[PDB]
């Protein structure tokens, strides 16, 4: 009755230089406010490690904001969050889920939460992590906004 | 084992201005069709009280709909937001928050936010949902705007 | 222990024939990649059947991906997509959960995904099937994407 679980909130995102056309991971908050990690959980190196195999379910919500690019017609842009594995065998990351949404907005500016979750079976020593398409547009400002998770069934 | 949980559907929700404020919680339907409370939990005007101490899923889906409003200006928006007031603390610490900005281009708009994330909740604490405003919220449907929670 | 449980994934999709004014229901797949069923949850006839009674945790997500359409203003497109129950009782199915937002997407075409999740108590032999507004416009590009998934708490 003490499975391993932990709910990670978001931070203000240390710039850090990563590969061109390639998805920018973040690193959160694991111990304040409402963030934890317990019962094995493991939140290292920007990683969420799994204690045991088993079947978790994972989510994570991202809420985006930005100007208003809008540009015929134009071509849309998009914002996107994507979370993904990486195990000891294939270090290739294996995508597990992933909310993609246009954007082509009018006003002032935008903003809009993308939330995703399902249920996984991980291998213990697989790390968990969440990607999205620019960083820069991720609102860091709330607790309650942006916020990733995982928990044994 | 069998642990504490509960499904909500929306309901009437009537209008108000008591005790003046903003971000109105809303009204849940506990029993009437695919809504149930079980296992201790049980809502109580506005409030989900947890019956059991422990790790919880909270979740919930809020559809909002109105005629388009005219909108390089300021847009509109809608939120909701899941709160846990607990009597040690007064302040209610919001856990949850969907905030979208709504600025269309038609006749009207409609669209569901949905919530879902686990949280470490203490026994005799109280859940309620808030919403930017009561009366974008669409009551119609139960399937369309729910709120639950369980023990994990 | 050995708790029922299963997600699927998105595939091509395989046309049907139009009989009813009713939702097109989607198939999966329940074996390859991301996909599962487990525990004598059985994918079976374009449905989910339950093994045993008691309360699930029902989840889906359906990415939209279509062509910018037109929208007195001209009223607004929408998608949806609604997990149904469908009882050995009464035939007559029975909506539990539905996702739906309009559209009017200015700019050349659009994208975005649907997602909804939530507990329910269901009996067994029950079934549970995933419906859409329109088949043409479901993203089955990826696993990630597009899909569906139950499990017993
Ligand atoms: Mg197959």
């Given at each position: 009755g003490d499975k391993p679980r932990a709910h ?28 934890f990690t317990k019962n094995r959980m493991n ?5 969420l490690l799994i204690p045991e195999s088993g079947d978790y379910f994972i989510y ?25 594995k ?32 399902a249920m996984f079976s991980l291998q213990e020593g697989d790390?968990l ?20 998770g995982a928990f044994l069934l």
């Amino acid at each position: 009755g003490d499975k391993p679980r932990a709910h990670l909130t978001v931070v203000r995102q240390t710039p850090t230089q990563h590969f061109k056309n390639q998805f920018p991971a973040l690193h959160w908050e694991h111990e304040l406010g409402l963030a934890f990690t317990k019962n094995r959980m493991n939140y290292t190196n920007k990683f969420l490690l799994i204690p045991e195999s088993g079947d978790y379910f994972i989510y994570s919500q991202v809420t985006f904001r930005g100007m208003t690019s809008e540009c015929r017609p134009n071509k849309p842009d998009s914002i996107t969050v994507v979370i993904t594995k990486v195990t000891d065998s294939y270090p290739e990351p294996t995508q597990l889920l992933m909310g993609t949404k246009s954007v082509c907005e009018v006003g002032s500016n935008w903003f809009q939460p993308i939330y995703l979750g399902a249920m996984f079976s991980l291998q213990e020593g697989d790390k968990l992590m969440v990607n999205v398409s620019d960083i820069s547009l991720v609102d860091y400002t709330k607790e309650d906004k942006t916020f990733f998770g995982a928990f044994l069934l």
